[PDB]
PDB file of C-alpha atoms in Angstrom:
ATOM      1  CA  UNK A   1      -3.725  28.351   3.183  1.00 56.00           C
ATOM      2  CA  UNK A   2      -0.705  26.579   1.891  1.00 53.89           C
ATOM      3  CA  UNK A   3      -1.025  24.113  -1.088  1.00 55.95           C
ATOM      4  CA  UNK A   4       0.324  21.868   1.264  1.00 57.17           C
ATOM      5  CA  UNK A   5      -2.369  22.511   3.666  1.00 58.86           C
ATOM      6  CA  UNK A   6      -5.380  22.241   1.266  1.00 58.58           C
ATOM      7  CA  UNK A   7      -4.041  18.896   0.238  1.00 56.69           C
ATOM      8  CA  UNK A   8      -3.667  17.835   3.360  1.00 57.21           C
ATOM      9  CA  UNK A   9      -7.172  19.138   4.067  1.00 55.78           C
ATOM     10  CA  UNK A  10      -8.379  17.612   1.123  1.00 56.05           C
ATOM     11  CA  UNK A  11      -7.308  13.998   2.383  1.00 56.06           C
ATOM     12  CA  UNK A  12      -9.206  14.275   5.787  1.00 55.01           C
ATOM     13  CA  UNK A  13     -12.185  15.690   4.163  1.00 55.69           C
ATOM     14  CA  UNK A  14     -12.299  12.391   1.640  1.00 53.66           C
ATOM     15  CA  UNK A  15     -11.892  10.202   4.478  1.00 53.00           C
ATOM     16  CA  UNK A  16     -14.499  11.736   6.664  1.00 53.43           C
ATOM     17  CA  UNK A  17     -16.913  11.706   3.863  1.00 53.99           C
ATOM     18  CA  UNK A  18     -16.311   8.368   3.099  1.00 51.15           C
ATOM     19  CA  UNK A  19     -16.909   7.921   6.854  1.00 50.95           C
ATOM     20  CA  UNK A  20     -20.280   9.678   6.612  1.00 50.15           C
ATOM     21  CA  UNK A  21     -21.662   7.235   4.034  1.00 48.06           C
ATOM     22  CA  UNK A  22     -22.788  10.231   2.543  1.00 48.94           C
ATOM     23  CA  UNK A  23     -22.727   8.469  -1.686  1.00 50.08           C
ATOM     24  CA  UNK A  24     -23.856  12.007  -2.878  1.00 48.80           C
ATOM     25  CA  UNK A  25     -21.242  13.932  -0.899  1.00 47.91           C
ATOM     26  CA  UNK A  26     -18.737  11.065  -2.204  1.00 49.55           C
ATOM     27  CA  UNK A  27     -19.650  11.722  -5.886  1.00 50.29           C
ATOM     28  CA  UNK A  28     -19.215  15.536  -5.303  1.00 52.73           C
ATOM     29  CA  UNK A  29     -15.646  15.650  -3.894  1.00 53.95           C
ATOM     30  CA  UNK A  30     -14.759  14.041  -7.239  1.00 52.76           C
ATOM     31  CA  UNK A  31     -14.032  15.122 -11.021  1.00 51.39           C
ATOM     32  CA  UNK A  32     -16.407  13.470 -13.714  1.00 51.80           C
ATOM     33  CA  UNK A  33     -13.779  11.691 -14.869  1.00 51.21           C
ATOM     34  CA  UNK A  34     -11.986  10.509 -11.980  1.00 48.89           C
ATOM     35  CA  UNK A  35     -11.004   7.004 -11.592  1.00 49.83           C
ATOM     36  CA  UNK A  36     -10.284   4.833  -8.384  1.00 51.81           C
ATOM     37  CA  UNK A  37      -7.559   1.945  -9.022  1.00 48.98           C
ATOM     38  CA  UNK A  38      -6.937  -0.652  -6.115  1.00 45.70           C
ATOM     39  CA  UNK A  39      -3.350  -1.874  -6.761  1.00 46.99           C
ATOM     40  CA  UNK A  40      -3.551  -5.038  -5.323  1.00 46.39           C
ATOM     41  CA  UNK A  41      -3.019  -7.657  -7.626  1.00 48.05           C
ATOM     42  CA  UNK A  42      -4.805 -10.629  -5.989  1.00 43.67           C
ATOM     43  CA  UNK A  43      -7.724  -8.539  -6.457  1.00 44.58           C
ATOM     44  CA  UNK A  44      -9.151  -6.489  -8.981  1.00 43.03           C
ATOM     45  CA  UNK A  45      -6.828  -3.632 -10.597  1.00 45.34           C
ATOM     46  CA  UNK A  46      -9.023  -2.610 -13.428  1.00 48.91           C
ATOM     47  CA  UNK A  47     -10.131   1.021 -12.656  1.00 46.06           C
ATOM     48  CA  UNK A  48     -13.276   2.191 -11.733  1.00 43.97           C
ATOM     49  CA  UNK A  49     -15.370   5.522 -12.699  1.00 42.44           C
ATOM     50  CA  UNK A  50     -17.512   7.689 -10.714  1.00 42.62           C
ATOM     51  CA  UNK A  51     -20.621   5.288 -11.457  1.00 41.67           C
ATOM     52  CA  UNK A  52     -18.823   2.201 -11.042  1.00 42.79           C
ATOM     53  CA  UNK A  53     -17.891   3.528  -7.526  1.00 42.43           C
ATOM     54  CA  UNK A  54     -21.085   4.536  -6.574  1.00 44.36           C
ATOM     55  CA  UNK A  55     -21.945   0.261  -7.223  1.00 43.67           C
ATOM     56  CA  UNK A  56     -19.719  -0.703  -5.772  1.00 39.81           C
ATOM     57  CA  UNK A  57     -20.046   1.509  -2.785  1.00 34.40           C
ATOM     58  CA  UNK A  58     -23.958  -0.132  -2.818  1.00 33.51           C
ATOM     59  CA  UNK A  59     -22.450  -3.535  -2.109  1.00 37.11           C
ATOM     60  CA  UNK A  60     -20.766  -2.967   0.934  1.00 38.55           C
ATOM     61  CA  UNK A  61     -23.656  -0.958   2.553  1.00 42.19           C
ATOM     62  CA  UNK A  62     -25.662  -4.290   2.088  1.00 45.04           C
ATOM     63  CA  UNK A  63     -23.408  -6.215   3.714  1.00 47.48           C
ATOM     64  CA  UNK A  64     -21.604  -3.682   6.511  1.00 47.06           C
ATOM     65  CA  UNK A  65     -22.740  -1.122   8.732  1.00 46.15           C
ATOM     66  CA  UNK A  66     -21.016   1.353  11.364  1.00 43.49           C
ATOM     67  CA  UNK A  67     -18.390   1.969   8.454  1.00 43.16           C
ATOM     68  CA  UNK A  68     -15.534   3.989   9.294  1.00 43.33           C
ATOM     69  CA  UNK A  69     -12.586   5.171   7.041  1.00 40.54           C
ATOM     70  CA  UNK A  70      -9.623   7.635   8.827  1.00 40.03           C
ATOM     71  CA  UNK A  71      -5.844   8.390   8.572  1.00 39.06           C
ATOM     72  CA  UNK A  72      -3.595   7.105  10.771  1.00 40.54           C
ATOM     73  CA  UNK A  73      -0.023   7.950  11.378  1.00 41.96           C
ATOM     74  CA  UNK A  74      -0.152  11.573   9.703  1.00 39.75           C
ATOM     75  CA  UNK A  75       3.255  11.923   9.905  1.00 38.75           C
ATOM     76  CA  UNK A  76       4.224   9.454   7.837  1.00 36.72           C
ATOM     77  CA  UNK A  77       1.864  11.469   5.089  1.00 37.23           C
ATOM     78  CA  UNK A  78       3.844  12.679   1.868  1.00 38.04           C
ATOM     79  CA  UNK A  79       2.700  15.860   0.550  1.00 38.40           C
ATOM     80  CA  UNK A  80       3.588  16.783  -3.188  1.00 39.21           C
ATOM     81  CA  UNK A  81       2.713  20.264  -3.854  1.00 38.07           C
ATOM     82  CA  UNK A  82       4.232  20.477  -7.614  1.00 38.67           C
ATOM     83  CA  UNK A  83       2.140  17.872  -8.414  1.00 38.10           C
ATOM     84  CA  UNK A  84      -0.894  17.987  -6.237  1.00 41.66           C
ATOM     85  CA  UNK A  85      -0.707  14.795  -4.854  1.00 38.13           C
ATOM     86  CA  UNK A  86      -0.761  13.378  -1.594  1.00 38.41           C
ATOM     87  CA  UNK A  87      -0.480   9.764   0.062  1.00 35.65           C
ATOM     88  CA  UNK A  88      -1.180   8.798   3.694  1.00 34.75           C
ATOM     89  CA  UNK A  89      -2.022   6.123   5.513  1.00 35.08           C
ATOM     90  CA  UNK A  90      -5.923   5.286   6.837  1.00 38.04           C
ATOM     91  CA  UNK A  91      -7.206   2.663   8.666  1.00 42.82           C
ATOM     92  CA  UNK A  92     -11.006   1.499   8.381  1.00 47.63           C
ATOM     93  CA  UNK A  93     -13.692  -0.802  10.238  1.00 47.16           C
ATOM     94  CA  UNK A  94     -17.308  -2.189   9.936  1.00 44.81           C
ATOM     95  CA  UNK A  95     -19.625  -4.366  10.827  1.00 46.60           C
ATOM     96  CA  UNK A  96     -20.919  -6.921   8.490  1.00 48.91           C
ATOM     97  CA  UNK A  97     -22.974 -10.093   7.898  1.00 51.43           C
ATOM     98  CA  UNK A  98     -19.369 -12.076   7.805  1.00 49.06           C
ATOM     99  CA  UNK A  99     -18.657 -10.302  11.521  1.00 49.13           C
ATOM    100  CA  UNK A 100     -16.067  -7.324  12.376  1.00 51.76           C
ATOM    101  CA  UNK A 101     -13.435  -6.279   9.454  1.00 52.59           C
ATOM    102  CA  UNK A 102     -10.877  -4.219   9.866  1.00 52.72           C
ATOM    103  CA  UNK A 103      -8.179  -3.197   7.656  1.00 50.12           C
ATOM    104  CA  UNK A 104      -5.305  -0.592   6.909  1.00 50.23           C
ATOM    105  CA  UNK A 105      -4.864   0.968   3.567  1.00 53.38           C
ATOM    106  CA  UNK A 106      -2.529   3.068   1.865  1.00 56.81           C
ATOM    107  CA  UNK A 107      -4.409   5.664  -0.388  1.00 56.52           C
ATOM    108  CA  UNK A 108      -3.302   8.691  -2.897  1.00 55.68           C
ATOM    109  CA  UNK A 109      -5.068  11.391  -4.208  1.00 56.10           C
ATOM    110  CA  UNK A 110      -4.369  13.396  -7.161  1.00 53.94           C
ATOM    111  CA  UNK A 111      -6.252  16.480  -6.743  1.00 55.43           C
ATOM    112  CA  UNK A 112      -6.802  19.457  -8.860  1.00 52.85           C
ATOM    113  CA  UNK A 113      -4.731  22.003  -9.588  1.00 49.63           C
ATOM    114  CA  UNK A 114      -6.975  24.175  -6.813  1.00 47.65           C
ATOM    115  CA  UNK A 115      -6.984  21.371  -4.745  1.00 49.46           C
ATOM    116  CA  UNK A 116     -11.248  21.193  -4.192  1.00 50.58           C
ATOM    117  CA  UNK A 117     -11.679  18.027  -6.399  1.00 51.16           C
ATOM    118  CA  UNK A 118     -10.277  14.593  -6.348  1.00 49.83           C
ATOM    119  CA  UNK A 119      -9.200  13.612 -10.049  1.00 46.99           C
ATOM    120  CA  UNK A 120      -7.360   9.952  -8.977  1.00 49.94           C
ATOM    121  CA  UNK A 121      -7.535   7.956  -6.847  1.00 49.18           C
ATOM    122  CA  UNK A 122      -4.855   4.696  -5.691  1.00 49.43           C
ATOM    123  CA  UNK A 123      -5.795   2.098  -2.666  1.00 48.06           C
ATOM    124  CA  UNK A 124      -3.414  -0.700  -1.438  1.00 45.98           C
ATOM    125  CA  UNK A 125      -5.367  -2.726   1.496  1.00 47.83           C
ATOM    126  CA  UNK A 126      -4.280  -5.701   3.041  1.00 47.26           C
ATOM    127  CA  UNK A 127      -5.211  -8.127   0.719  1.00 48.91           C
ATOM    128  CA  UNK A 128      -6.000 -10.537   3.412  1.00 49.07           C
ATOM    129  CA  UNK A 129      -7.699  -9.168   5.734  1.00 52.45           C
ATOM    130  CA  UNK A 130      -9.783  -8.616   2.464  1.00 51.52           C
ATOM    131  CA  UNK A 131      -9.656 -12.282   1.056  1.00 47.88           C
ATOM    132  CA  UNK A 132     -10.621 -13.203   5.073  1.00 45.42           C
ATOM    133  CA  UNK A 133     -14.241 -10.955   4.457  1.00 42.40           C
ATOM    134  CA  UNK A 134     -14.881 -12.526   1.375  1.00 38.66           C
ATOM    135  CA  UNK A 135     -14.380 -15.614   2.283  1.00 43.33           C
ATOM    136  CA  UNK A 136     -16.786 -15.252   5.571  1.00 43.87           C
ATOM    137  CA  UNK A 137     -19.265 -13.708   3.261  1.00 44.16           C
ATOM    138  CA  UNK A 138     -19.048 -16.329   0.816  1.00 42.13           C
ATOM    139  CA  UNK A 139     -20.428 -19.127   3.716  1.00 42.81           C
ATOM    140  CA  UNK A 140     -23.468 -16.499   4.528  1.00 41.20           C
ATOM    141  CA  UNK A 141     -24.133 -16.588   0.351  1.00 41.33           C
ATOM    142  CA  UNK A 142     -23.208 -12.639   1.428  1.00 43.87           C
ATOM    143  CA  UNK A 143     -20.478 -12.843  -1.326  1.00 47.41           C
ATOM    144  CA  UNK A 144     -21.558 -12.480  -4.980  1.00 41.58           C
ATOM    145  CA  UNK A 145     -21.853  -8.982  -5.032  1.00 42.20           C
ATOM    146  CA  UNK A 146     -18.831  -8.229  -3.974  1.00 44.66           C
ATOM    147  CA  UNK A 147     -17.030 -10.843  -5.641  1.00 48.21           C
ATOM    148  CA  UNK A 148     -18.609  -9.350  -9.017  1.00 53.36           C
ATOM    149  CA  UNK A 149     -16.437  -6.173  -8.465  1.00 53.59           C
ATOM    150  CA  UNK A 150     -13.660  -7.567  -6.431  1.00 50.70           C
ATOM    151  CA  UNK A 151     -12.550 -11.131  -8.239  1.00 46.39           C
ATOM    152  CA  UNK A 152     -10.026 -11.176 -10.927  1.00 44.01           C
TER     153      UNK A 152
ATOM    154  CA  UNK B   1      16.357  20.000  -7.384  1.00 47.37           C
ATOM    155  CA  UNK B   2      15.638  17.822  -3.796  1.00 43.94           C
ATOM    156  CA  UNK B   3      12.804  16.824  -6.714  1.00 45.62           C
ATOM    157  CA  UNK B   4      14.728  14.673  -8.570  1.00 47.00           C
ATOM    158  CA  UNK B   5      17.252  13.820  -5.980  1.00 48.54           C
ATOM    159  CA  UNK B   6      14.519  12.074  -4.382  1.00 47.54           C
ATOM    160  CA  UNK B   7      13.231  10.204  -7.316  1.00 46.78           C
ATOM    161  CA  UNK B   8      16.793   9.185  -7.760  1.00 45.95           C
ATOM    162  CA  UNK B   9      17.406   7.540  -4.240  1.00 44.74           C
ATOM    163  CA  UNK B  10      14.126   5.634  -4.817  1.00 47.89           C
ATOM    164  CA  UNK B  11      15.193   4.092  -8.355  1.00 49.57           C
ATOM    165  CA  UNK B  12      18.640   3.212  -6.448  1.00 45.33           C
ATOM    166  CA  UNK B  13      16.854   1.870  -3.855  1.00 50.03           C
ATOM    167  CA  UNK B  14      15.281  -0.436  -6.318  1.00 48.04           C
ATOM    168  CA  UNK B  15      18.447  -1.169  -8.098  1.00 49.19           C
ATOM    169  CA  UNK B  16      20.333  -1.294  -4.791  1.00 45.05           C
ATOM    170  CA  UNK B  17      17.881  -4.316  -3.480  1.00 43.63           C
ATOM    171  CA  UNK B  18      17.655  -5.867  -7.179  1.00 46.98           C
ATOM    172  CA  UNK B  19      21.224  -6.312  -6.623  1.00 48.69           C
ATOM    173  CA  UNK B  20      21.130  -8.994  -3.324  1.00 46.84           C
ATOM    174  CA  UNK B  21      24.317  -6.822  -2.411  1.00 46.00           C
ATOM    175  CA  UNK B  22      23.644  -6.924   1.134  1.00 40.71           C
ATOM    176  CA  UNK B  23      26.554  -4.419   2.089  1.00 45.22           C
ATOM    177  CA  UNK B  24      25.124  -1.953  -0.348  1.00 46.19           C
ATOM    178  CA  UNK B  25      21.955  -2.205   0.841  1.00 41.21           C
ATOM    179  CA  UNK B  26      23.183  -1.325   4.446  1.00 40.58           C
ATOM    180  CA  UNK B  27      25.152   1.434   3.148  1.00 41.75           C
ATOM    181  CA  UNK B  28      22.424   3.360   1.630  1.00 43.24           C
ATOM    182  CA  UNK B  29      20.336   3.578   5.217  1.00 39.02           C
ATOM    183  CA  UNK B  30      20.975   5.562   8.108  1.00 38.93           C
ATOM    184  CA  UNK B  31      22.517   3.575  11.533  1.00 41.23           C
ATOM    185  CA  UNK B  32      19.029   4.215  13.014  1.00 41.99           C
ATOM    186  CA  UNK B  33      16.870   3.296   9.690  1.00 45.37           C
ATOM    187  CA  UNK B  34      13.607   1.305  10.552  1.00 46.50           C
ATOM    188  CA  UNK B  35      11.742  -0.506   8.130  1.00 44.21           C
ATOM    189  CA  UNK B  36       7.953  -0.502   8.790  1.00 49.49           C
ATOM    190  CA  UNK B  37       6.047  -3.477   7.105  1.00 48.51           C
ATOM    191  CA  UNK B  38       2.436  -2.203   7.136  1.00 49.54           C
ATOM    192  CA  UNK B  39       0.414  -4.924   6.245  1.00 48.41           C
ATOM    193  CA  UNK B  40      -1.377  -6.124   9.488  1.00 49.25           C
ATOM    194  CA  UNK B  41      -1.890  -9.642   8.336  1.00 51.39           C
ATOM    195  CA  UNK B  42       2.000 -10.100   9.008  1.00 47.90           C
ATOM    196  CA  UNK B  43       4.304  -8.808  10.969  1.00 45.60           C
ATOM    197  CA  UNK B  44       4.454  -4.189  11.451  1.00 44.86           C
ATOM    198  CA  UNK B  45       6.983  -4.385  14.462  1.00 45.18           C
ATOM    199  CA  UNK B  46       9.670  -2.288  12.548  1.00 44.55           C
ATOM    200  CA  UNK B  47      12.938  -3.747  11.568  1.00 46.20           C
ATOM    201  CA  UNK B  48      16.109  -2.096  12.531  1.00 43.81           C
ATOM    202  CA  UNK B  49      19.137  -2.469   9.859  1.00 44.84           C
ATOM    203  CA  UNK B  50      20.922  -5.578  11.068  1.00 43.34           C
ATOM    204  CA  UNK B  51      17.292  -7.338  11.545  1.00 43.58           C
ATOM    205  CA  UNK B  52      16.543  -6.421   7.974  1.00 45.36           C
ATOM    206  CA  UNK B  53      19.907  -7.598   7.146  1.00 48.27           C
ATOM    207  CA  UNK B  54      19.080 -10.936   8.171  1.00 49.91           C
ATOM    208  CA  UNK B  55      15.564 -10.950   6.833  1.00 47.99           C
ATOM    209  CA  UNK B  56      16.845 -10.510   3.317  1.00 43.54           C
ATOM    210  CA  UNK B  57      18.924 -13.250   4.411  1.00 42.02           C
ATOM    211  CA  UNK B  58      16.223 -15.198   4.910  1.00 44.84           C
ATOM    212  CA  UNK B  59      14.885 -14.512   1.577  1.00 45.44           C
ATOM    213  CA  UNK B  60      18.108 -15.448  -0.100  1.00 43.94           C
ATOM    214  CA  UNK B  61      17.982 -19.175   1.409  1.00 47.27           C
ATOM    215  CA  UNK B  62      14.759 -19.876   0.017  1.00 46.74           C
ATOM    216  CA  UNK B  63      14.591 -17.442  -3.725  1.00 45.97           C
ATOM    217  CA  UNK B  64      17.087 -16.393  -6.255  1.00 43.27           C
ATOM    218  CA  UNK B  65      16.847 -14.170  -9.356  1.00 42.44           C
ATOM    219  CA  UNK B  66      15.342 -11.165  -6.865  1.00 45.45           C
ATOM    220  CA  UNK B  67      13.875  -8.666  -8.850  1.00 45.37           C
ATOM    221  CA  UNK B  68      12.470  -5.041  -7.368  1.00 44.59           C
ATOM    222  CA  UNK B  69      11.859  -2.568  -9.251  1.00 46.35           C
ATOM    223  CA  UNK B  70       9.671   1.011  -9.817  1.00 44.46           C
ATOM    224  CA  UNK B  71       6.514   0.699 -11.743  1.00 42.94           C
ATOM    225  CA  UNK B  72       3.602   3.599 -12.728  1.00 43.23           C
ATOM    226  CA  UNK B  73       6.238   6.412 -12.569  1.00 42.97           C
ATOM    227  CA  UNK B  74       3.814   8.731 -12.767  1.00 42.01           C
ATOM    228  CA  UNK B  75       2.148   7.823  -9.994  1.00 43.10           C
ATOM    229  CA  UNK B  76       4.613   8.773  -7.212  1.00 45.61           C
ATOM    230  CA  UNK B  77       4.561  11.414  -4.933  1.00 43.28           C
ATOM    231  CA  UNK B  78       7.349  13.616  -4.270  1.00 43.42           C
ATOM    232  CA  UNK B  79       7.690  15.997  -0.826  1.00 43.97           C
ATOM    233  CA  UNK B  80      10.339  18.144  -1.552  1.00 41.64           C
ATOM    234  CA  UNK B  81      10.001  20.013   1.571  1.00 41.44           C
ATOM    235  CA  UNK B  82       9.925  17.053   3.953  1.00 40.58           C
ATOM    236  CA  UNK B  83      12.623  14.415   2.089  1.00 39.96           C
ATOM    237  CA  UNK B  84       9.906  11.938   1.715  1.00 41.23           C
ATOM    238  CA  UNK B  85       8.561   9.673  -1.875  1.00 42.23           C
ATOM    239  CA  UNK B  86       6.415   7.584  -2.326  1.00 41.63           C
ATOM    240  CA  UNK B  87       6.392   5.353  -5.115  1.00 44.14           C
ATOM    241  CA  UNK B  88       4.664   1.861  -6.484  1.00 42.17           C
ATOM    242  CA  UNK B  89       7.212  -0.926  -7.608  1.00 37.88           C
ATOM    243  CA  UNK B  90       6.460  -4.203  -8.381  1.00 38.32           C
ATOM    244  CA  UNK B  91       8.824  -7.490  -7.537  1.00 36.43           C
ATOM    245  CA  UNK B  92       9.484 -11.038  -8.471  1.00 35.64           C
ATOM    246  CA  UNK B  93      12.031 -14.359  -7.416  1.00 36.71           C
ATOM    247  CA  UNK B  94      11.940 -17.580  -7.845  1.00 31.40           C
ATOM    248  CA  UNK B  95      11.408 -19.359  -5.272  1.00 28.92           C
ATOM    249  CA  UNK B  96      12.369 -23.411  -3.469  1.00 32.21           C
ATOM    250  CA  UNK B  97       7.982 -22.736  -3.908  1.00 34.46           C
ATOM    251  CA  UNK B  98       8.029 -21.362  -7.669  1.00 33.63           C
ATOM    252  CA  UNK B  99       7.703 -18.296  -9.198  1.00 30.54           C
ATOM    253  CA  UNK B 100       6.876 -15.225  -6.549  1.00 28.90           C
ATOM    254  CA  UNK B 101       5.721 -11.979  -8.187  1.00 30.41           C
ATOM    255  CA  UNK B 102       4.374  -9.210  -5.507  1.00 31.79           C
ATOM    256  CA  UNK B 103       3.682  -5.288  -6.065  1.00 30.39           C
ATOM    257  CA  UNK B 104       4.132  -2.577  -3.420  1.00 30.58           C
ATOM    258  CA  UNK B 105       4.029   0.572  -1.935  1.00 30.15           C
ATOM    259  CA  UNK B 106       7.141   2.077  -0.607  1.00 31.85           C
ATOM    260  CA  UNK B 107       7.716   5.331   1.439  1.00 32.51           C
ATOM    261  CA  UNK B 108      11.137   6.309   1.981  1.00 34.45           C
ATOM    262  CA  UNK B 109      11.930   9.136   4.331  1.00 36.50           C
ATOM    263  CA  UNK B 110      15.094  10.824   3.154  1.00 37.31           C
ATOM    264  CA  UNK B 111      17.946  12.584   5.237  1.00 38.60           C
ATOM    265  CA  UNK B 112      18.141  16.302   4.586  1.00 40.34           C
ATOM    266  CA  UNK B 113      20.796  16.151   1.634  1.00 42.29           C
ATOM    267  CA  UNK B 114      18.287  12.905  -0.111  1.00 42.58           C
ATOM    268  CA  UNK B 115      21.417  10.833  -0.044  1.00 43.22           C
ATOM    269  CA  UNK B 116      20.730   8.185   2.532  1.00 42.06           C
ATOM    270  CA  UNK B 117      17.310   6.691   4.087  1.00 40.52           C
ATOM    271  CA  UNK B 118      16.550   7.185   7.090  1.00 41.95           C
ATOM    272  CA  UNK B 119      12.842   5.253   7.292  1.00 41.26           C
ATOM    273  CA  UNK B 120      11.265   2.678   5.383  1.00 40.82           C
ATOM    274  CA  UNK B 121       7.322   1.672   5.000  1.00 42.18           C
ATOM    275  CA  UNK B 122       6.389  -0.770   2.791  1.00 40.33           C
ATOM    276  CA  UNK B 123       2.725  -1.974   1.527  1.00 40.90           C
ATOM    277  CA  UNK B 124       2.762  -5.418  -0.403  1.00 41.01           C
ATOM    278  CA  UNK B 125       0.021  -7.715  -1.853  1.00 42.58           C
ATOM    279  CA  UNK B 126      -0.303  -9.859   1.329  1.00 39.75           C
ATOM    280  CA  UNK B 127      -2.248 -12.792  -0.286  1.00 40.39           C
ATOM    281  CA  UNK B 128       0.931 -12.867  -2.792  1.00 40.98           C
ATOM    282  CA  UNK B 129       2.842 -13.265  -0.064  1.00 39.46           C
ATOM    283  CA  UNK B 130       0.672 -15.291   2.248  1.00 41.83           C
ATOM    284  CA  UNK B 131       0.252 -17.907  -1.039  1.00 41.82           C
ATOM    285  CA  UNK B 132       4.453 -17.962  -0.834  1.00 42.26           C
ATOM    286  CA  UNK B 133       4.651 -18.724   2.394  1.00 38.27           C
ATOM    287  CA  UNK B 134       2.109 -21.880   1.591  1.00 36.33           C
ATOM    288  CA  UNK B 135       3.999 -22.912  -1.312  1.00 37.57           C
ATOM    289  CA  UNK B 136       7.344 -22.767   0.704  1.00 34.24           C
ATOM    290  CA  UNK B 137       5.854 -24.690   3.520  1.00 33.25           C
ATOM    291  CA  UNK B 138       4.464 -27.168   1.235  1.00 34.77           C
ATOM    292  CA  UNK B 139       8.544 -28.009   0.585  1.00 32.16           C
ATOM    293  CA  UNK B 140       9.078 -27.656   4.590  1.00 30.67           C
ATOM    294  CA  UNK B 141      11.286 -24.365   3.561  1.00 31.71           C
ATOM    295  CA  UNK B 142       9.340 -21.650   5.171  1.00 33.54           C
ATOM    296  CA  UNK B 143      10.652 -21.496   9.038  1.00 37.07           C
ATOM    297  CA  UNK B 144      12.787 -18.826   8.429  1.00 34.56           C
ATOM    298  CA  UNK B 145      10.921 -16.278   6.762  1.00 34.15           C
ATOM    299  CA  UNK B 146       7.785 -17.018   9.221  1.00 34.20           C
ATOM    300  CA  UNK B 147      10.230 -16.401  12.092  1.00 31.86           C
ATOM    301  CA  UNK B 148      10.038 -12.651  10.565  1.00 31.59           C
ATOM    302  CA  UNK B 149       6.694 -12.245   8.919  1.00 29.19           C
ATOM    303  CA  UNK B 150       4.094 -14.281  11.299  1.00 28.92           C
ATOM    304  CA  UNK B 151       1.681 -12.788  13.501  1.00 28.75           C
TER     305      UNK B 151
END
């Protein structure tokens, strides 16, 4: 097993256990002091721990269901062995109280130096196909608990 | 070291766009460069080098004082081994509609010797964008980037 490879194995598995809904299993891939940052500035960019994650995480099971997270397009996947990094490309899709959402992300990991823990995390989204949930949410009164971790 | 070659072709990427120099953009891709916009609120049908060529035309008709440049250097991710970066940047203009300021993703794919680019992919803030495109329509000046970035 390559660093390359572990990396790259690393990705899938944080995607699949995202996919699993599996909070505990989430938690356990990470580092205590990880932090997520989604760099999209109409949302949100202030960064999140492992307890703010595990909120926020909350919130969207209450409103979606059926929630699936998974890279797309491997090979356009950069793999950065020196510095234990990776970025790829995932799509993801649920069902929620506003109706379907579906959206495509852009996501690195910095892992440890071993490669079995995720230490950082980045997320770009498309922004509207985000604004579009909230806003379909927001005429259910579905909203306010995203918006509390989402709005600017 | 293909390390730092790489991290120099995406600052003169940067630079290179910064610049509005159309030519010089041009010259720094590969004849068979596509850029990939992958934000599926607007247009992903890749972009071949004289379509971006008129895109950033586009651009030019409506903004001025184009800025593009990398931010969070130490968040980018370097693959020596396949010619690829990726790296965040952040970019601004005014605009016919104001002030734009965006911030992005970019993957470039490299050719072997990192001195051209051979593939593009680009993540941006598409409510930023989306919020543009209002503003220029507002001031009926947004036909010919929706031409490009619709649907």
């Amino acid at each position: 097993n390559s660093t390359r490879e572990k990396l790259i194995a690393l990705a899938h598995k944080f995607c699949s256990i995202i996919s699993s809904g599996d909070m505990e299993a989430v938690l356990a891939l990470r580092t205590e002091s990880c932090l997520t940052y989604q760099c999209c500035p109409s949302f949100s960019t202030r960064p999140l721990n492992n307890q703010e994650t595990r909120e926020y995480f909350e919130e969207w099971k209450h409103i979606g269901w059926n929630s699936k997270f998974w890279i797309i397009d491997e090979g356009t996947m950069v793999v950065d062995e020196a510095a234990k990094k990776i970025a790829f490309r995932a799509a993801c899709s649920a069902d929620t109280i506003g109706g379907p959402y579906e959206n495509e992300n852009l996501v690195i990991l910095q892992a440890t130096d071993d490669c079995a823990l995720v230490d950082g995390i980045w997320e770009f989204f498309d922004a509207v196909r985000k604004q579009d949930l909230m806003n379909r949410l927001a005429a259910k009164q579905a909203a306010k608990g995203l918006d509390s971790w989402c709005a600017n």
